Amino acid sequence: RVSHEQFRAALQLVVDPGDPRSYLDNFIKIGEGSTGIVCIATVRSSGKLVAVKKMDLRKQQRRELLFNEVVIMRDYQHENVVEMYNSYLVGDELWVVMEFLEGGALTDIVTHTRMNEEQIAAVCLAVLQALSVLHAQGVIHRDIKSDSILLTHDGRVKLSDFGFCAQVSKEVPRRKSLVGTPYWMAPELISRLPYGPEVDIWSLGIMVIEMVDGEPPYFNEPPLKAMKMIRDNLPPRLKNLHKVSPSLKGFLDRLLVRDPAQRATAAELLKHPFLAKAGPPASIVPLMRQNRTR
């Protein structure tokens, strides 16, 4: 394991030089994240909001993840992936300056209201389009869940929160690391087996359950207990199974497949006729907190 000094030096070569407090002001904390805190700030010259994630290099279990997030954000851009404007080192902190997405996170929708199948298909389609491109390059997100799905003001999906991502290669085609969010984790990953991009497809299935049911399976169990049930049991069932179409159930059945070798890929899923239901971005807008009644 390389020293802090050597890790920082490596990271320093890939981030933008300088101090971002020269450009940004009016910092407001908005959250505790997956490897740090998240703020909003205004860019001095425009008065435009940006999001800024701050991660302490010295308080990370897997520092390499900081490096991964920066490099993947720099090199693998997509219309359905959150944009990184710049990154900086400020002492022993990594700051990542991101676009601010006015729609907020999908979690806020699934916990406050009920999506219809056209809306569910729109979200799935957009996530799958991003994943197909990312997976083709060996990038694994490893933390798919509604919290990682952000929405623009006009209802477009942006996959976000690459703080736990990895990249596989011909030389090192699988990862073994037990990482993610307990209730969303793929059974192969919980089992600490060599895994690949397929883990994201399972996680997406659990997010479909969120979109139908409001919460993932086993959410009331201690995390290690939930992980045992995902590992050992038949795939989780929709609590609101009675509400769903044959197309949706057929779709979900291709995601929540325990053997990763039998699980559908993102590229296969883009052709599933459930996604023919997808509404446009205008269909998501009324779900967002700023438009909700009640």
Partner: peptide, 11 residues
């Protein structure tokens, strides 16, 4: 436990 935090458990 209804916690939504991402976690690194092991390499």
């Amino acid at each position: 436990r209804r916690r939504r935090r991402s976690w690194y458990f092991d390499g």
